[PDB]
Symmetry: D2
Subunit: 335 residues, 4 copies
């Protein structure tokens, strides 16, 4: 049986011995002349090392050379939201320009966007250095905890980034995460990954690559993009509605074993009619995932309840009935 966390406190200690105190190279593209950026890459990874859950995100000081490229990705891509982007993202980004502080000059710290996501849907961002485990990033996302990075792509590559940075996720991930039914859907991707096998971790990350990271929506009839990495780079948002890639309909099995690269612009895409339809289709795929149990996210204590017994489903079922009797008493109150 593969391992999965139980509390958000247990999310740290068993996912830092595998993901942290690791001396990482600069980028997988080997060798940069960016040593003062590498020390900026080294200090930015050391914030997530001593960070434990419940402690706040320590704020990041920024020099102007990554602020100006944060400005360069801002003024390009915010103008690129009227082009080909999801309309749910447009109202979410308008909320992020008022609440979080999405601007050209000031890059928002990870705390104030985390305080935004707890007030909208209850997600929180979690600072982490690497994407080094595909399981642990998915196992955290079940806890309504999005693993996020605190670094920026380099000024030499301001448009295409081979690794997810704050320009990737604060503009691509978390404006989708401010949606309610997407955040329940993106969690149920991670809710299927607890104790899931390594090919199921791969299949869910194959699924996660094509309906959250790089996924195309359909709002008001017209097809728009809602993927995180689609709304993170310059030409790919122009590429997804362009027709030299092909857009399949979103299927569970076709997104389970889909081949994918990470460097050039992706060929296969998955059109999703709505975030709820992605949630209904993840309900079909998470059922057939073979597992000796299943898990329910217990959102009061923000934990995971293993349903490895009929008795465990019962103490979840009264957790439904204590708030369904709330609905039974609310329908008496209103009227």
């Amino acid at each position: 049986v593969p391992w999965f966390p139980r509390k958000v406190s247990e999310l740290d200690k068993c996912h830092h011995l595998v993901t942290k105190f690791d001396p990482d190279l600069d980028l997988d593209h080997p060798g940069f002349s960016d040593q003062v950026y590498r020390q900026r890459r080294k200090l930015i990874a050391e914030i997530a090392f001593q960070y434990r859950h419940g402690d706040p995100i320590p704020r990041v000081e920024y020099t102007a050379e990554e602020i100006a490229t944060w400005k360069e990705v801002y003024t390009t891509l915010k103008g690129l939201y009227a082009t080909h982007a999801c309309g749910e993202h447009l109202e979410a980004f308008a909320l992020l320009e008022r609440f979080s502080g999405y601007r050209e000059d000031n890059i928002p710290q990870l705390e104030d966007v985390s305080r935004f996501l707890k007030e909208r849907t209850g997600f929180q961002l979690r600072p982490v250095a690497g994407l080094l485990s595909a399981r642990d990033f998915l196992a955290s996302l079940a806890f309504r905890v999005f693993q996020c990075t605190q670094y920026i792509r380099h000024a030499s590559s301001p448009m295409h980034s081979p690794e997810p940075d704050c320009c990737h996720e604060l503009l691509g991930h978390v404006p989708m995460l401010a949606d309610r039914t997407f955040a329940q859907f993106s969690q149920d991707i991670g809710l299927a990954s607890l104790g899931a096998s390594d090919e199921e971790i791969e299949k869910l990350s194959t699924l996660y690559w094509f309906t959250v990271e790089f996924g195309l929506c359909k709002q008001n009839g017209e097809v728009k993009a809602y993927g995180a990495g689609l709304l993170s780079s310059y030409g790919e948002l122009l590429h997804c509605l362009s027709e030299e890639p092909e857009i399949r309909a979103f299927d569970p099995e076709a997104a389970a074993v889909q081949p994918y690269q990470d460097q050039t612009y992706q060929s296969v895409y998955f059109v999703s009619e709505s975030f709820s339809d992605a949630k209904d289709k993840l309900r079909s795929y998470a059922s057939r995932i073979q597992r000796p149990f299943s898990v329910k996210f217990d959102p009061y204590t923000l934990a995971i309840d293993v349903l490895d017994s009929p008795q465990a489903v019962r103490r979840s079922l009264e957790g439904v009935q204590d708030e369904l009797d709330t609905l039974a008493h609310a329908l008496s109150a209103i009227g």
Copy 2:
């Protein structure tokens, strides 16, 4: 219509113009020769002033004269947990001696005990100076937020305290709050106080006085105490099972308009068979609480969904069916 909070971010700004920047006197008993304790009372009042939600509780430095009285209330009342105290409190206090850091010499800081309650039930302790509003302390309690006071009673009164301190709540309130059934019960007391009138606030606070603050339980046949203030003082825990006060059965309306004082050891007590019997009896009382709506705690975003329409109950009921479809897909998985 009275005012009630909507988010935990809105819990601070509309409950500090009414409860904070108030220059408080030392104690309601007028006149102490405790000026170096009054500046200690003043600095412990100002830590909650600029405290905003989402920020952690800053740690408190302690001089030895309140350490020794924290040591005095510890070695007496932990010895008084075999006598007349709840067994559900007893295993909880055993968890509080291991996880939170309860001992003789060091008083546990508020961050470590609040991070404990995130792991158990999802309550959090929130630092506040005064008990200045009886509505807002109940209005925060629906948000799974317990208003708590970071000061200590004076060394001249080590046993009886006229005001709730850390010796009141960190030994009386929180080890009840770590129970799952009592936390849902104590929140439903606060869930009736949202938008409720001032005599309904007073009816609920008289109810809160007799089934959370001073409430007596019944485990293993014998009657024990589970009240917060009962498990907070020297002689009162020996007084509640004594027969010179009378213990009534816990009733919805006979706890609503029950008279109460605060100085003398209390006469009337309310025996509760279990916390679930306290929960279903609050379900009967909060139903008849007259209100233009009812409110439901949204445990994902830690907020309140006001159900003032049939449409508002639906967007809760979609959250119930997405919760139940997790359960139906779990019962397919287990078996």
Copy 3:
């Protein structure tokens, strides 16, 4: 594990193999000089001989003396329904008098009152001569099917009957069965009795003796009677609220093993605050009833679902999800 029916057609064969084609004597009191009444009992018994489920009840002919003692029990007991009887039974009796055909001169046949119960709550009266198995009558009452006797007590004993007749059941059982929550209550006793062992069958029939057959209610503060046999005989309805019997509170375990006779007017009675509270106490008793499975009454096909696996509870919960999506769409429709 003993035997219990699954379909309503399987209420017939395995409960007529043990309770039918039995040569029955006239009364358990030894010896009547009433051979024409014996032929009446024999013909009434062979009405239920070839009766299968889905067939209507064949109408019963009545001569002058059973019509006259029906008039006697009707004009005594309807006049006594103002005396110490349930007001819910009073309004249900008014509904029976305008709907089913309750009058002094004509005794109502079983078909019209059965069509009334399928109109109100969905019970059906089902003709059978003897109560020969205490297990099978309860296991029928699981199916919302009340086994019922199509004969009349003796004319020389118009007030006290040693056996349940139409003057017993049509006066005491069926106007309680037309109530919603008491029907769901009395169905849950048989739902507890499905596949239960012999001393569990004895305990559940013993409970049924004290909360359906002879059970006492409390409406508007005042104690009244709602039991079947209490509201079936003349002197017992005035005896039960007299003080020479003792009335304990309704308890799940103290009604399970409570001793009882049947000839003398009963000593111990069980006051119930409401039929809903009786339903909660039967829920708490039926929880602790030891059984390798449970059963859910599926009221669409009127059948019984064994929950002996999490898969069975899943395909039970899917119908709950259809009927709750019905409510979630209804709350969108209304507003």
Copy 4:
């Protein structure tokens, strides 16, 4: 507001002043030389006139020539069930050949097949002469009551029938109605027609024409037919899988206003992936149907609860938790 029934007893009273005591002609094709068949059509039309609910179906005598065309349709169409027909029908027709009494020589009476539908899903066949109101046949279907015709098409036209006969519905309708999901699905079509406007009756009947009467399924990958009239006539069952008609995908609104004829083999068909997917897609279409309320089928009393208030939704919701606490105590029983 249009009129809708409330009980199954009230289903007869206000759907016989509008559909019964009307002298109907032989066929809509004007003029047959079939006077002794017209009296056979008349006596079948008069068996439904004095029919009431709860009163069972009286048996129908059959002479040779309606048996001889029942001989003809049973040899041809049962051979046409391995070809192009739904496999869920095939196991149901095998269930219908065993239980109901389906054979070549004896046309089964309506009582033995209606006793089967109460045994599987809880539907019942209700004898009626004409389909004269498209609302009332839909308004009955919400009650799990299928309006059905106890006559047979003439021997001169034994393969194509201009009107639904016993060969239409006992081979087409009821072996679909024995499915658990389809009976819930076909009721939800009728559940949208309560108090619905005449264009909504027409929109539902055009919907009912294309997903129950003439609807094509997709079982095990291959496309098969599950429509009632498709599995009722000779050449149409080979026509629907043929390619000179076109089979659209089943849609909510494209089935609502879809034009249709009745004489020529139908052009447009609606492929449905499963009966549950048709139930999900009727959940989407009947949601957007404008109505002053919605209706819930209360399957205990076999009646309809009109949900024109939040209070009416609440007395449904206590029915949910009453059988959810059944499920909550079942998950404790099993384990």
